[PDB]
């Protein structure tokens, strides 16, 4: 099968390839975050959305990958090598799982236009020149809750 | 966090730990499986559902241990060893996603329910004494005279 | 005193041996039943049955009684009087207990008469010569209130 | 899974193990107290209560640790005591058993909500300081019509 | 800063002082006693008084100081240095300890005034000569607001 | 038992941890700042607020652990366990101090609410790759005669 993570979500893996690996906060800063924000929500019984329903796979997926990394390395007779195949993890998936885990916790925060937006904004920033762009990158932010227009028209 | 992937589909690792390894199809089996019945709605731009959604992700998960596991398998000395890997992988995470692809796709065809109370049928059979129990395993499956007037 | 640990449940220990040994599920296998089954109950805070209080104590007693095994087999200076042990409780003691959790978790999921009359059905049945009986054994097939 | 055989009668393992060992009496002097205040209903065939069917199973448990300590004794020792098995079982589970059986037999005679203050009355003295307390421990004790005078 | 923690509950280090060492219960039978009969309050998210407050900081306190003097003693290879640390424990902040954990547990039990009375009255007996005084320590106890009469008269 | 010094707050332990150790000022600059803004109200015989007591004893709690940690730096034989001792603070203790105080002090002066979501929006900038985020962290805020 040739199945797409992305696309049930309106994206795919060639967007997100589209943003330099540097754009994305690491592994552990991902998951520290999932856990800060919506701990309660993915330990629910509740599926509450389909970006729940998948952010709960891919974090138990990096830790499938990494428990199995940990446990070969254990068996490296070489003590040195410890985190070898650890570090094999982090070198070929580890930018998968970046693009992945933050995909989803941005649209549960953002929801998927803003961040799909967001991506092309950044990955169109990064690719002008130094010396011709904006210093600062463009910013992720969420949309207000109401729109001036229906503010004005309750006043 | 401690996620169960079982819990939002109403059951739990532990429940899924009290079927015996050899209840379940391979996981090549259970794949083939899944792309036999369900290829097209995998791969649509739907959700489809939420065992749809898991089951993407599970299916993707096991290419990338199977990726991680043969680069450790190819790239290791002795036959011993590689058979301790493949061994490690039959053991916990092979049986772990063994249970994972048969809960979500049987569930696709026979709804939570009916695979909730197959489990403990099953599991219940497996531990009765063969020369105790039928010989077959339990099997997972799916008008008044004023009718006519 | 002498306390027949099914007389309250309308059985006797007479009744449970009238089974062969082989006729019981493991300890192990039925220990994982009753969690499979039945933790939530028997881990709340209510007495649910009698049943369930009597499968609490079996459960915690057969935990006790590993315990001071493995403290038997840890601390016997000789190898093969640890097997005897070994042997000793898979003979008695074990099999006392895989009569009781049986009795109680079958009766959780049949209640009493079906269980007592199975009890009755099976070990007729295995006294019947091999070739002279059906092949297949009987089935165990079909309970809120408790009078005293 | 994990049981506290206490808690369907209100009451957790942590609770009993608030009062010191001294504070119970020993398995024998309590299953001596068993037979001689419920001997008739804990061999009856009826359930009487659940302190009943708790109280039925703790009796049979011990017997099947003593049976096992027995054994082993007589059949794996010679020159030993054979009172080795024995000894340990009584050092390590026997405490638990004095604080089950107390509780049960206690809770038959004065009821669940006077036991645990008892408990925690208790509890408490043995931790105020000998020459700071009352010399005596707490007690554990619990308790005609108009017309007829006129 | 100089903050006195019983300030703010109407007594002073050196009213608590008053009291012999040998009155106050050990910490660990004081803390057995708190979690005997206040683990759910303490444990639970309402601050349900100050005196709960207070006291939640100083289990968590003295669990601070044990677990430093733990890793001071195992990681101090000489066995009588050990034992400095615990007699060093015992003769200085162990005293403290029991002082304000008593306090704490007793004032939750007993009020404030019931406890204050206590303290003097301990103080006083133990501070009276032996051969002159009642052989039994006073009783930590409620004492009744109104006495039988007036209880009956407002019947 | 197992309290949480948060909890009756409004706060986990889990969260004060989201945030890294480089974010907290030291324990030595929070108790200046609890002096400076609260030491009348911390010295005073009032409540004042579940913050106030919480704080009283905190502040109380590190001169008990830094007496114990001197009497040990100073009767210890060789420097670099000396060392020791201080890394063990800066590590460990003095790390669960400069969350707590750092807490309390904030609530006192910008409420709960704006506390707990500013600990949110600075551990979410902070790892954010440094290229890609604001330059700056996120910042934690909140005649009389006429109407006679
Ligand atoms: C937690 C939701 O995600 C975010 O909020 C995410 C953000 C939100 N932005 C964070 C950085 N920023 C601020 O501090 N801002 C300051 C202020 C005052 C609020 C404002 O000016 O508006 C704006 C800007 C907003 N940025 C990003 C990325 N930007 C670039 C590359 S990556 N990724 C995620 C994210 C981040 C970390 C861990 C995660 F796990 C994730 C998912
Ligand atoms: C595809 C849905 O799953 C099934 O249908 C599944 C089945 C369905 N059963 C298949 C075997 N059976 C028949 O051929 N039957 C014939 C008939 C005529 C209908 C009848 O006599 O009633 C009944 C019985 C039904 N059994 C199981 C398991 N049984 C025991 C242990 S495992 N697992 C899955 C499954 C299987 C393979 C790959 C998968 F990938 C999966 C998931
Ligand atoms: C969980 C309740 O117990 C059972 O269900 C028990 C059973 C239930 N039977 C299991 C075997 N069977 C099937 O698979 N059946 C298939 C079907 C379709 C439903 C039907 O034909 O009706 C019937 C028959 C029913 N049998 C027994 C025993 N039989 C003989 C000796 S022992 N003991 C217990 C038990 C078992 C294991 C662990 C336990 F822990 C226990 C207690
Ligand atoms: C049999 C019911 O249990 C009791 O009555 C129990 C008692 C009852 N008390 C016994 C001692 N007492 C008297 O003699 N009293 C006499 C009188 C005249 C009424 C008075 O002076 O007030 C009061 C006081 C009541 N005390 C206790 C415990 N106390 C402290 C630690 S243990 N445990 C159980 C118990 C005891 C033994 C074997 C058991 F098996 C058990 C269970
Ligand atoms: C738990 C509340 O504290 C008490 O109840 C406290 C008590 C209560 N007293 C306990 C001893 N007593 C009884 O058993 N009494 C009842 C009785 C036997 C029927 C009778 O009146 O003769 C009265 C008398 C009341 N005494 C004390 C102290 N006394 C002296 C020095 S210290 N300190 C605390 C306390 C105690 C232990 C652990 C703690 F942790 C604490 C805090
Ligand atoms: C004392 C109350 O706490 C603060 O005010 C606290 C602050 C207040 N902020 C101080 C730094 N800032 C300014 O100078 N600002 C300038 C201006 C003009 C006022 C504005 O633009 O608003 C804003 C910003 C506000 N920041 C923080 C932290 N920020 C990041 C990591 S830590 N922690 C505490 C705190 C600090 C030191 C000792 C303490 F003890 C504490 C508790
Ligand atoms: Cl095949
Ligand atoms: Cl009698
Ligand atoms: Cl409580
Ligand atoms: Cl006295
Ligand atoms: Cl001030």
């Known amino acids: 099968m040739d199945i797409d993570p992305y696309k049930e979500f309106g994206a795919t893996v060639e967007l997100l390839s589209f943003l330099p690996s540097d754009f994305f906060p690491s592994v552990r800063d991902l998951l520290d975050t999932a856990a800060a924000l919506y701990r309660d ?3 629910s019984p509740e599926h509450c959305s389909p970006h729940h329903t998948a952010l709960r796979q891919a974090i138990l997926c990096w830790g499938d990958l990494m428990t199995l990394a ?3 390395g254990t068996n490296l007779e070489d003590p040195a090598s410890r985190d070898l195949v650890v570090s094999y993890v982090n070198t070929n998936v580890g930018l998968k799982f970046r693009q992945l885990l933050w995909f989803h916790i941005s649209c549960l925060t953002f929801g998927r236009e803003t961040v799909l937006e967001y991506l092309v904004s950044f990955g169109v920033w990064i690719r002008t020149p130094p010396a011709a762009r904006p210093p600062n990158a463009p ?8 729109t001036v227009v229906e503010n004005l028209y309750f006043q």
Do not use: F, R, Y
């Open 70 to 72: 940990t446990w070969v």
């Open 139 to 146: 910013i992720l932010s969420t949309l207000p809750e109401t």
């Open 41 to 43: 929500a993915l330990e």
